[PDB]
Swiss-Prot record:
Subcellular location: Cytoplasmic vesicle
Organism: Thaumatococcus daniellii (Katemfe)
Recorded family membership: Belongs to the thaumatin family.
InterPro entries: Osmotin/thaumatin-like_sf, Thaumatin, Thaumatin_CS
Lineage of origin: Eukaryota, Viridiplantae, Streptophyta, Embryophyta, Tracheophyta
One cellular-component annotation, GO: cytoplasmic vesicle
Keyword Flavoprotein appears in the UniProt entry: no
Name used for this protein in its record: Thaumatin I
Record function comment: Taste-modifying protein; intensely sweet-tasting. It is 100000 times sweeter than sucrose on a molar basis.
Length: 206
């Protein structure tokens, strides 16, 4: 499957793509404002994520640090990034179907649209100013708006027992972005697309 990753933000982002134990494609790249990066993701990939990282410094070897979404100091991510990260999540060719969603379960850093470029399903978006409106206790100094599990590490926010409810913090994310997951047991906002669809992830869509 082809994913085109587009930075429409006015600032540079460092895109990342991983399935948690491996990079997808090159795993990461700098995207200046307006740049597009096309990756190929193997069919059958389960549990893939794409995110943006902000305020990164990398040396010649591809080693460094980012203020949001750092993936163990690497330009080319092999693992998932440090919150806060708005996530585009996908599982491809799962019994004939692809499944896509946007999640705020690991917080929010950059607004995102995640849409198919082929026929037969809808896209999803979270483009509200979550950072500007972020509750004081969830604001990350480096930038972004953390989820409550990251910040407080309770069973309730992290849904550790597999029973949890919505919270004042999850409802914040859900009010601003209804079409994104706000906590682990949120009513799913997954979209079912035809197997082997292609997609575009746009940072700062509006």
């Amino acid at each position: 499957a082809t994913f085109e990753i587009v930075n429409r933000c006015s600032y540079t982002v460092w895109a990342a793509a991983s399935k948690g134990d491996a990079a997808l494609d090159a795993g990461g790249r700098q995207l200046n404002s307006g740049e597009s990066w096309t990756i190929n993701v193997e069919p059958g990939t389960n549990g893939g994520k794409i995110w943006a990282r902000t305020d990164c410094y990398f040396d010649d070897s591809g080693s460094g640090i980012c203020k949001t979404g750092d993936c163990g100091g690497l330009l080319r991510c092999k693992r998932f990034g440090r919150p806060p990260t708005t996530l585009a999540e996908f599982s491809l060719n799962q019994y004939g179907k692809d499944y896509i969603d946007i999640s705020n379960i690991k917080g929010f850093n950059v607004p995102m649209d995640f849409s198919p470029t082929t026929r037969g399903c809808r896209g999803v978006r979270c483009a509200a100013d979550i950072v500007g409106q972020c509750p004081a206790k969830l604001k990350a100094p480096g930038g972004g708006c953390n989820d409550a599990c990251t910040v407080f590490q309770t069973s309730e926010y992290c849904c550790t027992t597999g029973k949890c409810g919505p919270t004042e913090y999850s409802r914040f994310f859900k009010r601003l972005c209804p079409d994104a997951f706000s906590y682990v047991l949120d009513k799913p906002t997954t979209v079912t697309c035809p197997g082997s669809s292609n997609y575009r992830v746009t940072f700062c869509p509006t």
